[PDB]
Write a protein that binds this ligand. Sequence first.
Ligand code: MG
Ligand code: MG
Ligand code: MG
Ligand code: MG
Ligand code: MG
Ligand code: MG
Ligand code: MG
Ligand code: MG
Ligand code: MG
Ligand code: MG
Ligand code: MG
Ligand code: MG
Ligand code: MG
Ligand code: MG
Ligand code: MG
Ligand code: MG
Ligand code: MG
Ligand code: MG
Ligand code: MG
Ligand code: MG
Ligand code: MG
Ligand code: MG
Ligand code: MG
Ligand code: MG
Ligand code: MG
Ligand code: MG
Ligand code: MG
Ligand code: MG
Ligand code: MG
Ligand code: MG
Ligand code: MG
Ligand code: MG
Ligand code: MG
Ligand code: MG
Ligand code: MG
Ligand code: MG
Ligand code: MG
Ligand code: MG
Ligand code: MG
Ligand code: MG
Ligand code: MG
Ligand code: MG
Ligand code: MG
Ligand code: MG
Ligand code: MG
Ligand code: MG
Ligand code: MG
Ligand code: MG
Ligand code: MG
Ligand code: MG
Ligand code: MG
Ligand code: MG
Ligand code: MG
Ligand code: MG
Ligand code: MG
Ligand code: MG
Ligand code: MG
Ligand code: MG
Ligand code: MG
Ligand code: MG
Ligand code: MG
Ligand code: MG
Ligand code: MG
Ligand code: MG
Ligand code: MG
Ligand code: MG
Ligand code: MG
Ligand code: MG
Ligand code: MG
Ligand code: MG
Ligand code: MG
Ligand code: MG
Ligand code: MG
Ligand code: MG
Ligand code: MG
Ligand code: MG
Lengths: 199, 88, 67
Amino acid sequence: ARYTGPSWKVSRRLGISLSGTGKELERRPYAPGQHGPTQRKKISEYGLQQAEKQKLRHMYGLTERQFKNTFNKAGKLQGKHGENFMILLEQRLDNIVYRLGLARTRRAARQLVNHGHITVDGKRVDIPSYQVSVGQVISVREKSAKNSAIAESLEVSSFVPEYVTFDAETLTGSLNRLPERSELAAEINEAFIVEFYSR
Amino acid sequence: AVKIRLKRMGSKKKPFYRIVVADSRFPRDGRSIETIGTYNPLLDPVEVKIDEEATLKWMHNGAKPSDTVRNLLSREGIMEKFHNQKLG
Amino acid sequence: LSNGIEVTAYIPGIGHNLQEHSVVLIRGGRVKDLPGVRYHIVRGALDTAGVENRGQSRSKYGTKKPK
RNA sequence: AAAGAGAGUUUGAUCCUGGCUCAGGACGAACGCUGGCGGCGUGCCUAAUACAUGCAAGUCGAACGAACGGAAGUUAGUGGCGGACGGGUGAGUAACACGUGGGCAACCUGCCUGUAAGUUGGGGAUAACUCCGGGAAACCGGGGCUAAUACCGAAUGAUAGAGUGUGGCGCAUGCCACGCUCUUGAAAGAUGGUUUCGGCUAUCGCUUACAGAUGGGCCCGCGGUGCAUUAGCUAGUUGGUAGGGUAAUGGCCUACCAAGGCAACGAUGCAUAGCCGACCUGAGAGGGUGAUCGGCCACACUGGGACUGAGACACGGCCCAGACUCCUACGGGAGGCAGCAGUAGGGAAUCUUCCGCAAUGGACGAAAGUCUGACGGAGCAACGCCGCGUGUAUGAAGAAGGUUUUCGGAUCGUAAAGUACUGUUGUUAGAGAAGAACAAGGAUAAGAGUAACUGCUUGUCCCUUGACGGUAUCUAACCAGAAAGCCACGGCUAACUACGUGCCAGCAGCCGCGGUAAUACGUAGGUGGCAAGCGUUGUCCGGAUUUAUUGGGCGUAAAGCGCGCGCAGGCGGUCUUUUAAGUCUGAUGUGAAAGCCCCCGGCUUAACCGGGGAGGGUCAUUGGAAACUG
Ligand SMILES: [Mg+2]
Ligand SMILES: [Mg+2]
Ligand SMILES: [Mg+2]
Ligand SMILES: [Mg+2]
Ligand SMILES: [Mg+2]
Ligand SMILES: [Mg+2]
Ligand SMILES: [Mg+2]
Ligand SMILES: [Mg+2]
Ligand SMILES: [Mg+2]
Ligand SMILES: [Mg+2]
Ligand SMILES: [Mg+2]
Ligand SMILES: [Mg+2]
Ligand SMILES: [Mg+2]
Ligand SMILES: [Mg+2]
Ligand SMILES: [Mg+2]
Ligand SMILES: [Mg+2]
Ligand SMILES: [Mg+2]
Ligand SMILES: [Mg+2]
Ligand SMILES: [Mg+2]
Ligand SMILES: [Mg+2]
Ligand SMILES: [Mg+2]
Ligand SMILES: [Mg+2]
Ligand SMILES: [Mg+2]
Ligand SMILES: [Mg+2]
Ligand SMILES: [Mg+2]
Ligand SMILES: [Mg+2]
Ligand SMILES: [Mg+2]
Ligand SMILES: [Mg+2]
Ligand SMILES: [Mg+2]
Ligand SMILES: [Mg+2]
Ligand SMILES: [Mg+2]
Ligand SMILES: [Mg+2]
Ligand SMILES: [Mg+2]
Ligand SMILES: [Mg+2]
Ligand SMILES: [Mg+2]
Ligand SMILES: [Mg+2]
Ligand SMILES: [Mg+2]
Ligand SMILES: [Mg+2]
Ligand SMILES: [Mg+2]
Ligand SMILES: [Mg+2]
Ligand SMILES: [Mg+2]
Ligand SMILES: [Mg+2]
Ligand SMILES: [Mg+2]
Ligand SMILES: [Mg+2]
Ligand SMILES: [Mg+2]
Ligand SMILES: [Mg+2]
Ligand SMILES: [Mg+2]
Ligand SMILES: [Mg+2]
Ligand SMILES: [Mg+2]
Ligand SMILES: [Mg+2]
Ligand SMILES: [Mg+2]
Ligand SMILES: [Mg+2]
Ligand SMILES: [Mg+2]
Ligand SMILES: [Mg+2]
Ligand SMILES: [Mg+2]
Ligand SMILES: [Mg+2]
Ligand SMILES: [Mg+2]
Ligand SMILES: [Mg+2]
Ligand SMILES: [Mg+2]
Ligand SMILES: [Mg+2]
Ligand SMILES: [Mg+2]
Ligand SMILES: [Mg+2]
Ligand SMILES: [Mg+2]
Ligand SMILES: [Mg+2]
Ligand SMILES: [Mg+2]
Ligand SMILES: [Mg+2]
Ligand SMILES: [Mg+2]
Ligand SMILES: [Mg+2]
Ligand SMILES: [Mg+2]
Ligand SMILES: [Mg+2]
Ligand SMILES: [Mg+2]
Ligand SMILES: [Mg+2]
Ligand SMILES: [Mg+2]
Ligand SMILES: [Mg+2]
Ligand SMILES: [Mg+2]
Ligand SMILES: [Mg+2]
């Protein structure tokens, strides 16, 4: 992807169960390193705001320059700023493939999108940062079709989000509607990041 | 003398010409009297949009085209209207 | 200096090799305790050599990475 | 709708005033360690220092005078047009140079378009060439003969000049239209059709005149640097009367008369600087800058002058003087990269002696076409801004190994190994766009003009061509294999332990660390920030309310003249009528294109392009209101 190191360690540092549910923090939920089972100290406002920014950035696994560019682009929309930021971050094609259930995590949908296996409106796209819109259709164009990875990922599914309509019979996915801040992770604080980028 | 040139604009390997009235001497993409259209060579039929009133007046008081500009791009029939107005 | 001005520089790092009549690059800065020294010598620029067996903070002092 | 973050340091501790330092953004950057790819841009900021060498401006045989062919066609010379465009640099310049808004009843305008009259007859001579005279030599004269759309007169023709007559007007000098007498004032032919044998003709050229368009010239209001440890400056200077000169008004110049003019609202003098659209920063007002892109100005080794032309006092033109360089037979000759590449030098620092006229635009030509270092493209450089790689999913109370240990463990860590997948990228083999529509030529159809064709204008059909380049793109097979580093970890500021060292070595932006237990020095383990980058230095804005209009102060912290008389200036009690300078407001014109911002669209997305708007002025003409200031 972009950062190819271990994935449990980053979730242990932040203190949330990103990349799924709890399987990273089942044992030893403390920070990595020789230290970590010792203690933590009073984290200042810089620490708190940086922590929230790392929460968002490491959840979707995108570099900081792209993160700030997406923040600035979201700033132009109407309404709030953090809400629009997370909405645009949800619009990304890489995320939508994960939401439909074609992959397992964020770091597998990225590889499955860059290697051309995903097409939108009948034409391939190799860009994980492509911003999907309403009404476009998402498919596989039998570029892979019947492969072990996709077939396995279609078994473990939980429930797809309400704002995405996925047709497993033809592997055709769509985006029904723009999401709302209620139906996101919500295990973060979107108000902190605006203050962090204000300084 | 006054002519009707193209004034190339766009990116490398992807040109997009305007249609300007200019005094020959001046640079290609330099100062120009007035712009009266565009010209996109890339499309299947070329998309061209020319104002039929300004072009007619400019031809009718001195300005004359330059090969590709108008003189071949006036498939809209501007030169036919000029023909009729000049005889009438 | 090459503009006809004589200044006083400082040699950072542990152990240099430059003697009299040698050519070097200098950069701005200052050493707070030293009275007149108000520039630094760039290490590994023209004839200065990088500090021997320096392991970290190695872009400064001009030491090439070990193999 | 937009709307502003603080922290460390004076004390044994306080609260204030006060400086210093740090946290953000940006580069035409450079240096240090590293370095995979693609798209789009950028690249002598210093010596306006000096040039080895290749190119960067020519073209017409359908305007005219020789050889090869055997009847076409091809170059030296006279002539026509171009060389004043295109390209470069910022030296000079504090001024109508530039920006914005106007005047010109005070002006010029080749080529382009429309219109109205003509294109009638003569003459003399020169280049080329041929001889002689110089010089080995580049480098010049004399004798003789030739053509023109070369040159010079003549016939006819002016809204040009003079003397008028008559109207209609303006803003003072004055402007528009008509008629009368005279005086002056031109031309060129070349390629074709034709009748009938004389001429009569098709375009494209020539001459005169009037309109339009384009391009220029002159004048004016307002606007944008520092210094008063720079106060007087000016003698064609200011005005006037005649004249000269210019396309044009004008002390632009001259002869005479007078003694004026500018200036503390900054004259004059010195220093620095091309100006703008715009760029960086800021909550905004502001502050700093004038790379690239576009508009204007100036310059072309330094200084002066003019010729040719519609246009120049002319980058690759001429004359003279100066410094430098190069040939010389010693009488003399030649040159100007701040055009594209490139060399030396200066510097901390900046690129290839590349391919092509296929696209767009120039010059010449009737046209084919010729020339275009403009331009279209390619090489170099992480110099920037975007994009995605170096894999993915499962996988243990957790192997080996490092580090640490109060010796039970903790950590690196699902990380590895193992099992199952993928080919962005890489390798190979295959295909393989657009950018190209013309110009020319050949067919018909219709119009204007003609006595009739040839031809001209317009429409409809054939007709062939790419530097980039086998580049963009696409298909199929193969292997997780080739593809991560830099800085920091005492506080500000996110992230701690072990060994060595012993006020030494050293670190450092500030507070400050090091004197045998150092989270601050050096290494190691792991941790944090960013990632084909990461740091340091230099410069600018911020935070700095630290020049405070928005937005500060003067009893004791820096800061009230020792006090009065007062010119200029600043401000001014109550009411009525009036004006319309300030003030508010409607309309018209403009404030170019690109750039910032709003809305759509096209490149697989994004940077990047395109289409449509808005915004920006103490801006001009004109019409309103009369509360406040005048
Ligand atoms: Mg380390
Ligand atoms: Mg004190
Ligand atoms: Mg800074
Ligand atoms: Mg490399
Ligand atoms: Mg290497
Ligand atoms: Mg220069
Ligand atoms: Mg010929
Ligand atoms: Mg010839
Ligand atoms: Mg020129
Ligand atoms: Mg020029
Ligand atoms: Mg240019
Ligand atoms: Mg300039
Ligand atoms: Mg004419
Ligand atoms: Mg004769
Ligand atoms: Mg002779
Ligand atoms: Mg003769
Ligand atoms: Mg005559
Ligand atoms: Mg007259
Ligand atoms: Mg009268
Ligand atoms: Mg005949
Ligand atoms: Mg006949
Ligand atoms: Mg006079
Ligand atoms: Mg002055
Ligand atoms: Mg100077
Ligand atoms: Mg200067
Ligand atoms: Mg800039
Ligand atoms: Mg910029
Ligand atoms: Mg700002
Ligand atoms: Mg401020
Ligand atoms: Mg500059
Ligand atoms: Mg420059
Ligand atoms: Mg240039
Ligand atoms: Mg020079
Ligand atoms: Mg002349
Ligand atoms: Mg010239
Ligand atoms: Mg030259
Ligand atoms: Mg050059
Ligand atoms: Mg060479
Ligand atoms: Mg060199
Ligand atoms: Mg040097
Ligand atoms: Mg060409
Ligand atoms: Mg040809
Ligand atoms: Mg040539
Ligand atoms: Mg170019
Ligand atoms: Mg570098
Ligand atoms: Mg560079
Ligand atoms: Mg994995
Ligand atoms: Mg265990
Ligand atoms: Mg071990
Ligand atoms: Mg491939
Ligand atoms: Mg075609
Ligand atoms: Mg034709
Ligand atoms: Mg015929
Ligand atoms: Mg494989
Ligand atoms: Mg901390
Ligand atoms: Mg250090
Ligand atoms: Mg520190
Ligand atoms: Mg790390
Ligand atoms: Mg990290
Ligand atoms: Mg990147
Ligand atoms: Mg600066
Ligand atoms: Mg301030
Ligand atoms: Mg104060
Ligand atoms: Mg005091
Ligand atoms: Mg007193
Ligand atoms: Mg005082
Ligand atoms: Mg007093
Ligand atoms: Mg008074
Ligand atoms: Mg307006
Ligand atoms: Mg504009
Ligand atoms: Mg789009
Ligand atoms: Mg644009
Ligand atoms: Mg636009
Ligand atoms: Mg408007
Ligand atoms: Mg009143
Ligand atoms: Mg009054």
